[PDB]
Amino acid sequence: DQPHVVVCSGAGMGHLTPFLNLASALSSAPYNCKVTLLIVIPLITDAESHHISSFFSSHPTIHRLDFHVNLPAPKPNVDPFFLRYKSISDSAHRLPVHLSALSPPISAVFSDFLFTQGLNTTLPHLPNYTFTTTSARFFTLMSYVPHLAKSSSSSPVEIPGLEPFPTDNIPPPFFNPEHIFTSFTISNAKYFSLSKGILVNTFDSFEPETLSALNSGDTLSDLPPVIPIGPLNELEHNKQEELLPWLDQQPEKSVLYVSFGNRTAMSSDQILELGMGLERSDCRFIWVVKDKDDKSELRKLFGEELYLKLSEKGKLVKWVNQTEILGHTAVGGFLSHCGWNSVMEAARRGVPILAWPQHGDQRENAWVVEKAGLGVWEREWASGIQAAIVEKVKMIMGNNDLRKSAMKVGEEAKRACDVGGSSATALMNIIGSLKR
């Protein structure tokens, strides 16, 4: 006999991906749960819709539960995704009727933090594990957002027991309780204390000081136990990656993989300076830039000479299977915005990271990457893109100390999700607790 659990996903690819990974893991040995995956519809982007469709087509054993939340009307100067997050957070109180009708009766819910207030007030007797999609480090700052304000938009934020958060790494909205993002962050963080636990896509040896402080009581907060369950096993995708034969022809650890995520907000001038920098570095690369087998946007953007020089040394592509790229021995480094999904996929493979963080949690994530020895954070990459790439690419691909520390990160990450590992054991204990 086996428990029936609900995975309650939100919106946005960065948030959907780890939730899909969790549902896939829980539906499979060794957890062997019955999984219902809740999707919020309509979806905002066609990319989201396609990935959800491919997920269910390749995991036919997982049940889909559509939770319809009307799209809010767009408003000038308000980010569309924040408006959608707000509408989801405001709908969470409606989940009881939907989760109660599931059969067999569910044993637990693993939920996006936008559902926290709704779930923990309207279903207080159902174990709710809040699954954050960022680092333990940045999660701690988010849970502190109610206790700011009380403000001082201008001082490093000192949470007891942890290294202070510099102002430049904190999203400025966090100091304004009436900002749309802060509003539902406060609403849901105020109810973290009633979740059964906070799950994090991290592992003990990746953030030991932060996790130690949290679970010893040092932060003085009312959080439940914060439980690393990462890194989560990557999804087997259908189509093996097309660049694998070309990678098979490149020397070991010679290729720089470049991807800033769907979120990235880099101007054409920045993309062009990056291209000029990669070209003058003469490194091999795979670069996800900007539908497409069109090079014309790339030929227009770089102009014809730069485009052809770049294509001599690397691949300019629309999309890749990122875990298949990061897992290949020819890839020697990863230039990334440091979204937490990308960090954890690099960590699993011991791939050194060059961190060019852009916004949100990314600068604290880059600090975590640097603290763990997984990579190097170029703090002012935007102030000189060409020099930044030319100077640091040789270090990423050739510094033996960083290659060594990154490889040991990879060994600890594999051990964490291996049999007996710290993360596998934690998630097994959770699932075991549901078996009466």
PDB file of C-alpha atoms in Angstrom, residues 104-386:
ATOM      1  CA  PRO A 104      -7.676   7.884  -2.549  1.00  0.00           C
ATOM      2  CA  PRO A 105      -7.683  10.486   0.262  1.00  0.00           C
ATOM      3  CA  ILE A 106      -4.415  12.377   0.037  1.00  0.00           C
ATOM      4  CA  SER A 107      -1.719  12.035   2.689  1.00  0.00           C
ATOM      5  CA  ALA A 108       0.257  15.253   2.062  1.00  0.00           C
ATOM      6  CA  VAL A 109       0.735  18.226  -0.235  1.00  0.00           C
ATOM      7  CA  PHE A 110       4.034  19.596  -1.571  1.00  0.00           C
ATOM      8  CA  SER A 111       3.212  23.153  -2.520  1.00  0.00           C
ATOM      9  CA  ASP A 112       4.553  26.293  -4.131  1.00  0.00           C
ATOM     10  CA  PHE A 113       4.989  28.996  -1.535  1.00  0.00           C
ATOM     11  CA  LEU A 114       2.188  31.014  -3.190  1.00  0.00           C
ATOM     12  CA  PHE A 115      -0.303  28.462  -1.773  1.00  0.00           C
ATOM     13  CA  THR A 116       1.019  28.699   1.794  1.00  0.00           C
ATOM     14  CA  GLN A 117      -1.571  30.984   3.387  1.00  0.00           C
ATOM     15  CA  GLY A 118      -4.489  29.267   1.633  1.00  0.00           C
ATOM     16  CA  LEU A 119      -3.409  25.708   2.438  1.00  0.00           C
ATOM     17  CA  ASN A 120      -2.345  26.257   6.034  1.00  0.00           C
ATOM     18  CA  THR A 121      -5.528  28.109   7.053  1.00  0.00           C
ATOM     19  CA  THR A 122      -8.141  26.134   5.149  1.00  0.00           C
ATOM     20  CA  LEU A 123      -6.551  22.659   5.450  1.00  0.00           C
ATOM     21  CA  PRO A 124      -4.695  22.801   8.785  1.00  0.00           C
ATOM     22  CA  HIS A 125      -4.819  19.010   9.400  1.00  0.00           C
ATOM     23  CA  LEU A 126      -3.264  18.069   6.041  1.00  0.00           C
ATOM     24  CA  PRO A 127       0.578  17.941   6.100  1.00  0.00           C
ATOM     25  CA  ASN A 128       1.745  20.736   3.799  1.00  0.00           C
ATOM     26  CA  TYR A 129       5.404  20.795   2.813  1.00  0.00           C
ATOM     27  CA  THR A 130       6.276  24.185   1.333  1.00  0.00           C
ATOM     28  CA  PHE A 131       8.780  23.553  -1.477  1.00  0.00           C
ATOM     29  CA  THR A 132      10.886  26.627  -2.189  1.00  0.00           C
ATOM     30  CA  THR A 133      12.616  26.801  -5.563  1.00  0.00           C
ATOM     31  CA  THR A 134      15.549  29.024  -4.567  1.00  0.00           C
ATOM     32  CA  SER A 135      18.611  28.544  -2.360  1.00  0.00           C
ATOM     33  CA  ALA A 136      18.287  28.045   1.381  1.00  0.00           C
ATOM     34  CA  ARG A 137      20.198  31.348   1.599  1.00  0.00           C
ATOM     35  CA  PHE A 138      17.743  33.405  -0.436  1.00  0.00           C
ATOM     36  CA  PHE A 139      14.767  31.557   1.032  1.00  0.00           C
ATOM     37  CA  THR A 140      15.870  32.768   4.442  1.00  0.00           C
ATOM     38  CA  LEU A 141      15.818  36.366   3.233  1.00  0.00           C
ATOM     39  CA  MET A 142      12.313  35.881   1.753  1.00  0.00           C
ATOM     40  CA  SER A 143      10.982  34.483   5.028  1.00  0.00           C
ATOM     41  CA  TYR A 144      12.413  37.584   6.737  1.00  0.00           C
ATOM     42  CA  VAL A 145      10.481  39.951   4.440  1.00  0.00           C
ATOM     43  CA  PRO A 146       7.648  40.252   6.883  1.00  0.00           C
ATOM     44  CA  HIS A 147      10.101  41.440   9.518  1.00  0.00           C
ATOM     45  CA  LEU A 148      11.511  44.049   7.471  1.00  0.00           C
ATOM     46  CA  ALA A 149       9.367  46.998   6.961  1.00  0.00           C
ATOM     47  CA  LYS A 150      10.280  48.514   9.650  1.00  0.00           C
ATOM     48  CA  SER A 151      12.358  49.117   6.648  1.00  0.00           C
ATOM     49  CA  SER A 152      15.638  50.907   6.293  1.00  0.00           C
ATOM     50  CA  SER A 153      15.943  50.304   2.618  1.00  0.00           C
ATOM     51  CA  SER A 154      19.415  51.354   3.228  1.00  0.00           C
ATOM     52  CA  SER A 155      21.294  49.016   5.458  1.00  0.00           C
ATOM     53  CA  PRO A 156      22.508  45.495   5.063  1.00  0.00           C
ATOM     54  CA  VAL A 157      19.906  43.112   6.458  1.00  0.00           C
ATOM     55  CA  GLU A 158      21.273  41.167   9.456  1.00  0.00           C
ATOM     56  CA  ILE A 159      19.295  37.994  10.095  1.00  0.00           C
ATOM     57  CA  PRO A 160      20.631  36.551  13.383  1.00  0.00           C
ATOM     58  CA  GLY A 161      23.099  33.759  12.849  1.00  0.00           C
ATOM     59  CA  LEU A 162      23.824  34.331   9.172  1.00  0.00           C
ATOM     60  CA  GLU A 163      26.203  36.488   7.212  1.00  0.00           C
ATOM     61  CA  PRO A 164      24.500  39.840   6.491  1.00  0.00           C
ATOM     62  CA  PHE A 165      22.678  40.452   3.206  1.00  0.00           C
ATOM     63  CA  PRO A 166      24.151  43.468   1.376  1.00  0.00           C
ATOM     64  CA  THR A 167      21.630  45.975   0.051  1.00  0.00           C
ATOM     65  CA  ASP A 168      22.696  45.395  -3.574  1.00  0.00           C
ATOM     66  CA  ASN A 169      21.659  41.726  -3.349  1.00  0.00           C
ATOM     67  CA  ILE A 170      18.153  42.469  -2.027  1.00  0.00           C
ATOM     68  CA  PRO A 171      15.317  43.167  -4.512  1.00  0.00           C
ATOM     69  CA  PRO A 172      14.396  46.806  -3.768  1.00  0.00           C
ATOM     70  CA  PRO A 173      10.644  45.941  -3.672  1.00  0.00           C
ATOM     71  CA  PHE A 174      11.228  43.891  -0.478  1.00  0.00           C
ATOM     72  CA  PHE A 175      11.455  47.173   1.470  1.00  0.00           C
ATOM     73  CA  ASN A 176       7.990  48.282   0.247  1.00  0.00           C
ATOM     74  CA  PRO A 177       5.128  46.285   1.854  1.00  0.00           C
ATOM     75  CA  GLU A 178       2.655  47.558  -0.762  1.00  0.00           C
ATOM     76  CA  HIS A 179       4.641  46.365  -3.772  1.00  0.00           C
ATOM     77  CA  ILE A 180       2.742  43.545  -5.475  1.00  0.00           C
ATOM     78  CA  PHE A 181       5.570  41.056  -5.037  1.00  0.00           C
ATOM     79  CA  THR A 182       6.177  41.950  -1.385  1.00  0.00           C
ATOM     80  CA  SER A 183       2.441  41.762  -0.661  1.00  0.00           C
ATOM     81  CA  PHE A 184       1.973  38.092  -1.450  1.00  0.00           C
ATOM     82  CA  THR A 185       5.461  37.278  -0.132  1.00  0.00           C
ATOM     83  CA  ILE A 186       4.403  38.655   3.258  1.00  0.00           C
ATOM     84  CA  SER A 187       0.987  36.968   3.063  1.00  0.00           C
ATOM     85  CA  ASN A 188       2.465  33.541   2.496  1.00  0.00           C
ATOM     86  CA  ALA A 189       5.630  33.859   4.613  1.00  0.00           C
ATOM     87  CA  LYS A 190       3.459  34.741   7.603  1.00  0.00           C
ATOM     88  CA  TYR A 191       2.124  31.152   7.394  1.00  0.00           C
ATOM     89  CA  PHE A 192       5.431  29.272   6.917  1.00  0.00           C
ATOM     90  CA  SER A 193       5.294  28.340  10.608  1.00  0.00           C
ATOM     91  CA  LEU A 194       2.298  26.066  10.010  1.00  0.00           C
ATOM     92  CA  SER A 195       3.859  24.097   7.175  1.00  0.00           C
ATOM     93  CA  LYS A 196       5.120  20.650   8.172  1.00  0.00           C
ATOM     94  CA  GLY A 197       8.496  21.554   6.674  1.00  0.00           C
ATOM     95  CA  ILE A 198      10.248  23.715   4.103  1.00  0.00           C
ATOM     96  CA  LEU A 199      11.765  21.638   1.323  1.00  0.00           C
ATOM     97  CA  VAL A 200      14.754  23.077  -0.554  1.00  0.00           C
ATOM     98  CA  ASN A 201      16.387  21.936  -3.786  1.00  0.00           C
ATOM     99  CA  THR A 202      19.812  21.973  -2.143  1.00  0.00           C
ATOM    100  CA  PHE A 203      21.992  19.598  -0.154  1.00  0.00           C
ATOM    101  CA  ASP A 204      23.595  19.698   3.271  1.00  0.00           C
ATOM    102  CA  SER A 205      27.231  20.135   2.217  1.00  0.00           C
ATOM    103  CA  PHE A 206      26.260  22.851  -0.333  1.00  0.00           C
ATOM    104  CA  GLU A 207      24.810  25.330   2.218  1.00  0.00           C
ATOM    105  CA  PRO A 208      25.990  23.975   5.590  1.00  0.00           C
ATOM    106  CA  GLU A 209      26.295  27.272   7.481  1.00  0.00           C
ATOM    107  CA  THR A 210      22.840  28.456   6.386  1.00  0.00           C
ATOM    108  CA  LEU A 211      21.171  25.101   7.047  1.00  0.00           C
ATOM    109  CA  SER A 212      22.989  24.685  10.383  1.00  0.00           C
ATOM    110  CA  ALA A 213      21.845  28.123  11.540  1.00  0.00           C
ATOM    111  CA  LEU A 214      18.251  27.472  10.473  1.00  0.00           C
ATOM    112  CA  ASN A 215      17.830  24.126  12.142  1.00  0.00           C
ATOM    113  CA  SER A 216      19.603  24.999  15.388  1.00  0.00           C
ATOM    114  CA  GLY A 217      17.277  27.922  16.177  1.00  0.00           C
ATOM    115  CA  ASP A 218      19.999  30.539  15.560  1.00  0.00           C
ATOM    116  CA  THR A 219      17.885  32.661  13.195  1.00  0.00           C
ATOM    117  CA  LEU A 220      15.232  33.108  15.954  1.00  0.00           C
ATOM    118  CA  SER A 221      12.464  32.624  13.375  1.00  0.00           C
ATOM    119  CA  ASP A 222       9.291  30.501  13.660  1.00  0.00           C
ATOM    120  CA  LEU A 223      10.090  28.331  10.618  1.00  0.00           C
ATOM    121  CA  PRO A 224       9.403  24.581  10.664  1.00  0.00           C
ATOM    122  CA  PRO A 225      12.344  22.282   9.810  1.00  0.00           C
ATOM    123  CA  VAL A 226      14.110  23.260   6.586  1.00  0.00           C
ATOM    124  CA  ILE A 227      14.804  20.070   4.679  1.00  0.00           C
ATOM    125  CA  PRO A 228      17.238  19.741   1.747  1.00  0.00           C
ATOM    126  CA  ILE A 229      16.014  17.249  -0.786  1.00  0.00           C
ATOM    127  CA  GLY A 230      18.297  18.040  -3.672  1.00  0.00           C
ATOM    128  CA  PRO A 231      19.691  17.883  -6.145  1.00  0.00           C
ATOM    129  CA  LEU A 232      16.652  16.409  -7.754  1.00  0.00           C
ATOM    130  CA  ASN A 233      17.095  13.845 -10.519  1.00  0.00           C
ATOM    131  CA  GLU A 234      16.932  15.386 -13.957  1.00  0.00           C
ATOM    132  CA  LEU A 235      14.075  14.465 -16.258  1.00  0.00           C
ATOM    133  CA  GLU A 236      14.665  11.983 -18.980  1.00  0.00           C
ATOM    134  CA  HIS A 237      13.752  13.813 -22.071  1.00  0.00           C
ATOM    135  CA  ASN A 238      12.823  12.070 -25.218  1.00  0.00           C
ATOM    136  CA  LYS A 239      15.164  13.290 -27.805  1.00  0.00           C
ATOM    137  CA  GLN A 240      18.790  12.927 -26.997  1.00  0.00           C
ATOM    138  CA  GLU A 241      20.512  16.249 -27.500  1.00  0.00           C
ATOM    139  CA  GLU A 242      21.506  17.080 -31.075  1.00  0.00           C
ATOM    140  CA  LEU A 243      24.845  18.659 -30.168  1.00  0.00           C
ATOM    141  CA  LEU A 244      26.069  15.480 -28.481  1.00  0.00           C
ATOM    142  CA  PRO A 245      27.936  14.232 -31.606  1.00  0.00           C
ATOM    143  CA  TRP A 246      29.688  17.595 -31.978  1.00  0.00           C
ATOM    144  CA  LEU A 247      30.540  17.575 -28.259  1.00  0.00           C
ATOM    145  CA  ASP A 248      31.884  14.037 -28.767  1.00  0.00           C
ATOM    146  CA  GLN A 249      34.440  15.621 -31.142  1.00  0.00           C
ATOM    147  CA  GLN A 250      35.618  18.309 -28.750  1.00  0.00           C
ATOM    148  CA  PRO A 251      38.498  17.814 -26.275  1.00  0.00           C
ATOM    149  CA  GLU A 252      37.539  16.955 -22.741  1.00  0.00           C
ATOM    150  CA  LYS A 253      36.508  19.989 -20.643  1.00  0.00           C
ATOM    151  CA  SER A 254      37.154  22.392 -23.536  1.00  0.00           C
ATOM    152  CA  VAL A 255      33.638  23.805 -24.134  1.00  0.00           C
ATOM    153  CA  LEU A 256      32.073  26.751 -22.322  1.00  0.00           C
ATOM    154  CA  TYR A 257      28.296  26.378 -22.050  1.00  0.00           C
ATOM    155  CA  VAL A 258      26.504  29.737 -22.012  1.00  0.00           C
ATOM    156  CA  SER A 259      22.861  30.103 -20.965  1.00  0.00           C
ATOM    157  CA  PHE A 260      21.127  32.891 -19.097  1.00  0.00           C
ATOM    158  CA  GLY A 261      17.680  31.384 -18.808  1.00  0.00           C
ATOM    159  CA  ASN A 262      14.257  32.400 -20.291  1.00  0.00           C
ATOM    160  CA  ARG A 263      14.067  35.224 -17.803  1.00  0.00           C
ATOM    161  CA  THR A 264      17.294  36.936 -18.799  1.00  0.00           C
ATOM    162  CA  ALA A 265      16.973  40.542 -19.545  1.00  0.00           C
ATOM    163  CA  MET A 266      20.077  41.264 -21.648  1.00  0.00           C
ATOM    164  CA  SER A 267      20.004  43.985 -24.294  1.00  0.00           C
ATOM    165  CA  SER A 268      21.153  43.451 -27.869  1.00  0.00           C
ATOM    166  CA  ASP A 269      24.187  45.601 -27.093  1.00  0.00           C
ATOM    167  CA  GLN A 270      25.081  43.267 -24.206  1.00  0.00           C
ATOM    168  CA  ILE A 271      24.603  40.169 -26.363  1.00  0.00           C
ATOM    169  CA  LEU A 272      26.817  41.745 -28.992  1.00  0.00           C
ATOM    170  CA  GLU A 273      29.600  42.610 -26.515  1.00  0.00           C
ATOM    171  CA  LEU A 274      29.422  39.048 -25.173  1.00  0.00           C
ATOM    172  CA  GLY A 275      29.795  37.724 -28.706  1.00  0.00           C
ATOM    173  CA  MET A 276      32.766  40.022 -29.301  1.00  0.00           C
ATOM    174  CA  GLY A 277      34.285  38.819 -26.052  1.00  0.00           C
ATOM    175  CA  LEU A 278      33.772  35.119 -26.788  1.00  0.00           C
ATOM    176  CA  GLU A 279      35.202  35.601 -30.269  1.00  0.00           C
ATOM    177  CA  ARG A 280      38.348  37.231 -29.001  1.00  0.00           C
ATOM    178  CA  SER A 281      38.695  34.509 -26.357  1.00  0.00           C
ATOM    179  CA  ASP A 282      38.755  31.876 -29.119  1.00  0.00           C
ATOM    180  CA  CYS A 283      37.223  29.323 -26.749  1.00  0.00           C
ATOM    181  CA  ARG A 284      34.872  26.583 -27.873  1.00  0.00           C
ATOM    182  CA  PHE A 285      31.322  27.163 -26.717  1.00  0.00           C
ATOM    183  CA  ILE A 286      27.644  26.336 -26.845  1.00  0.00           C
ATOM    184  CA  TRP A 287      25.638  29.544 -26.422  1.00  0.00           C
ATOM    185  CA  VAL A 288      21.847  29.656 -26.006  1.00  0.00           C
ATOM    186  CA  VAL A 289      20.955  33.072 -27.422  1.00  0.00           C
ATOM    187  CA  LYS A 290      17.424  34.417 -28.012  1.00  0.00           C
ATOM    188  CA  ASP A 291      10.648  29.446 -33.877  1.00  0.00           C
ATOM    189  CA  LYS A 292      14.293  29.297 -34.746  1.00  0.00           C
ATOM    190  CA  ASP A 293      16.601  27.645 -37.055  1.00  0.00           C
ATOM    191  CA  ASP A 294      17.011  31.228 -38.231  1.00  0.00           C
ATOM    192  CA  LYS A 295      20.492  32.635 -38.095  1.00  0.00           C
ATOM    193  CA  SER A 296      19.274  35.901 -39.611  1.00  0.00           C
ATOM    194  CA  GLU A 297      18.528  37.479 -36.237  1.00  0.00           C
ATOM    195  CA  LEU A 298      21.992  36.263 -35.243  1.00  0.00           C
ATOM    196  CA  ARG A 299      23.518  37.501 -38.496  1.00  0.00           C
ATOM    197  CA  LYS A 300      21.711  40.839 -38.088  1.00  0.00           C
ATOM    198  CA  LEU A 301      22.732  41.064 -34.426  1.00  0.00           C
ATOM    199  CA  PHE A 302      26.408  40.181 -34.771  1.00  0.00           C
ATOM    200  CA  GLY A 303      26.913  41.296 -38.385  1.00  0.00           C
ATOM    201  CA  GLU A 304      28.304  38.863 -40.854  1.00  0.00           C
ATOM    202  CA  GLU A 305      32.015  38.759 -39.902  1.00  0.00           C
ATOM    203  CA  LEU A 306      31.498  38.291 -36.168  1.00  0.00           C
ATOM    204  CA  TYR A 307      28.744  35.715 -36.691  1.00  0.00           C
ATOM    205  CA  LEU A 308      30.955  33.586 -38.934  1.00  0.00           C
ATOM    206  CA  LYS A 309      33.965  33.848 -36.604  1.00  0.00           C
ATOM    207  CA  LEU A 310      31.809  32.744 -33.664  1.00  0.00           C
ATOM    208  CA  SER A 311      30.341  29.862 -35.661  1.00  0.00           C
ATOM    209  CA  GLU A 312      33.902  28.656 -36.381  1.00  0.00           C
ATOM    210  CA  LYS A 313      34.491  28.003 -32.666  1.00  0.00           C
ATOM    211  CA  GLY A 314      31.093  27.390 -31.084  1.00  0.00           C
ATOM    212  CA  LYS A 315      27.381  26.744 -31.531  1.00  0.00           C
ATOM    213  CA  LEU A 316      24.767  29.511 -31.430  1.00  0.00           C
ATOM    214  CA  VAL A 317      21.472  27.769 -30.691  1.00  0.00           C
ATOM    215  CA  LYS A 318      17.844  28.423 -29.749  1.00  0.00           C
ATOM    216  CA  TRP A 319      17.528  25.707 -27.081  1.00  0.00           C
ATOM    217  CA  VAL A 320      19.311  22.693 -25.600  1.00  0.00           C
ATOM    218  CA  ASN A 321      18.639  19.826 -23.224  1.00  0.00           C
ATOM    219  CA  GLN A 322      20.687  21.506 -20.501  1.00  0.00           C
ATOM    220  CA  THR A 323      21.322  18.465 -18.290  1.00  0.00           C
ATOM    221  CA  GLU A 324      22.638  16.509 -21.293  1.00  0.00           C
ATOM    222  CA  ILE A 325      25.030  19.360 -22.150  1.00  0.00           C
ATOM    223  CA  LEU A 326      26.201  19.796 -18.550  1.00  0.00           C
ATOM    224  CA  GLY A 327      26.718  16.051 -18.196  1.00  0.00           C
ATOM    225  CA  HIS A 328      29.080  15.705 -21.180  1.00  0.00           C
ATOM    226  CA  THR A 329      32.809  15.416 -20.507  1.00  0.00           C
ATOM    227  CA  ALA A 330      33.698  18.037 -23.159  1.00  0.00           C
ATOM    228  CA  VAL A 331      31.938  20.821 -21.210  1.00  0.00           C
ATOM    229  CA  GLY A 332      34.450  22.602 -18.992  1.00  0.00           C
ATOM    230  CA  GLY A 333      32.453  25.480 -17.562  1.00  0.00           C
ATOM    231  CA  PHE A 334      29.081  27.155 -17.350  1.00  0.00           C
ATOM    232  CA  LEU A 335      28.444  30.881 -17.830  1.00  0.00           C
ATOM    233  CA  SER A 336      25.120  31.468 -16.128  1.00  0.00           C
ATOM    234  CA  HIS A 337      22.775  34.036 -14.545  1.00  0.00           C
ATOM    235  CA  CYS A 338      22.736  31.684 -11.496  1.00  0.00           C
ATOM    236  CA  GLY A 339      19.066  30.853 -11.337  1.00  0.00           C
ATOM    237  CA  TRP A 340      18.839  28.113  -8.741  1.00  0.00           C
ATOM    238  CA  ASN A 341      17.756  25.339 -11.120  1.00  0.00           C
ATOM    239  CA  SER A 342      20.846  25.957 -13.256  1.00  0.00           C
ATOM    240  CA  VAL A 343      23.126  26.093 -10.203  1.00  0.00           C
ATOM    241  CA  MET A 344      21.837  22.725  -8.986  1.00  0.00           C
ATOM    242  CA  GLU A 345      22.161  21.098 -12.408  1.00  0.00           C
ATOM    243  CA  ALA A 346      25.755  22.325 -12.587  1.00  0.00           C
ATOM    244  CA  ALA A 347      26.407  21.209  -9.005  1.00  0.00           C
ATOM    245  CA  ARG A 348      25.234  17.673  -9.753  1.00  0.00           C
ATOM    246  CA  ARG A 349      27.813  17.465 -12.577  1.00  0.00           C
ATOM    247  CA  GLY A 350      30.669  19.359 -10.891  1.00  0.00           C
ATOM    248  CA  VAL A 351      30.740  21.942 -13.697  1.00  0.00           C
ATOM    249  CA  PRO A 352      32.532  25.200 -12.731  1.00  0.00           C
ATOM    250  CA  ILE A 353      30.265  28.236 -12.947  1.00  0.00           C
ATOM    251  CA  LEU A 354      31.072  31.730 -14.099  1.00  0.00           C
ATOM    252  CA  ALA A 355      28.290  33.694 -12.389  1.00  0.00           C
ATOM    253  CA  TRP A 356      26.851  36.813 -14.061  1.00  0.00           C
ATOM    254  CA  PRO A 357      23.749  37.309 -11.890  1.00  0.00           C
ATOM    255  CA  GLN A 358      21.045  39.669 -13.085  1.00  0.00           C
ATOM    256  CA  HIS A 359      18.181  40.090 -10.598  1.00  0.00           C
ATOM    257  CA  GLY A 360      16.117  38.558  -7.840  1.00  0.00           C
ATOM    258  CA  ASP A 361      17.770  35.726  -5.982  1.00  0.00           C
ATOM    259  CA  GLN A 362      20.666  35.462  -8.441  1.00  0.00           C
ATOM    260  CA  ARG A 363      23.306  37.499  -6.660  1.00  0.00           C
ATOM    261  CA  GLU A 364      22.832  35.640  -3.368  1.00  0.00           C
ATOM    262  CA  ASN A 365      22.855  32.365  -5.336  1.00  0.00           C
ATOM    263  CA  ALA A 366      26.139  33.462  -6.955  1.00  0.00           C
ATOM    264  CA  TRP A 367      27.589  34.082  -3.504  1.00  0.00           C
ATOM    265  CA  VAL A 368      26.491  30.574  -2.439  1.00  0.00           C
ATOM    266  CA  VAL A 369      28.162  29.165  -5.583  1.00  0.00           C
ATOM    267  CA  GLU A 370      31.368  31.005  -4.755  1.00  0.00           C
ATOM    268  CA  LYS A 371      31.275  29.975  -1.074  1.00  0.00           C
ATOM    269  CA  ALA A 372      30.867  26.315  -2.044  1.00  0.00           C
ATOM    270  CA  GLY A 373      33.793  26.357  -4.487  1.00  0.00           C
ATOM    271  CA  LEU A 374      31.506  25.630  -7.429  1.00  0.00           C
ATOM    272  CA  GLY A 375      32.328  28.840  -9.283  1.00  0.00           C
ATOM    273  CA  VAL A 376      33.323  32.489  -9.428  1.00  0.00           C
ATOM    274  CA  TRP A 377      31.031  35.507  -9.284  1.00  0.00           C
ATOM    275  CA  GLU A 378      31.976  38.415 -11.570  1.00  0.00           C
ATOM    276  CA  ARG A 379      30.387  41.167  -9.516  1.00  0.00           C
ATOM    277  CA  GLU A 380      30.518  43.950 -12.103  1.00  0.00           C
ATOM    278  CA  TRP A 381      30.283  41.878 -15.285  1.00  0.00           C
ATOM    279  CA  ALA A 382      27.908  44.453 -16.778  1.00  0.00           C
ATOM    280  CA  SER A 383      30.493  47.242 -16.436  1.00  0.00           C
ATOM    281  CA  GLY A 384      32.822  45.532 -18.927  1.00  0.00           C
ATOM    282  CA  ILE A 385      31.403  42.511 -20.681  1.00  0.00           C
ATOM    283  CA  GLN A 386      34.192  41.928 -23.213  1.00  0.00           C
TER     284      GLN A 386
END
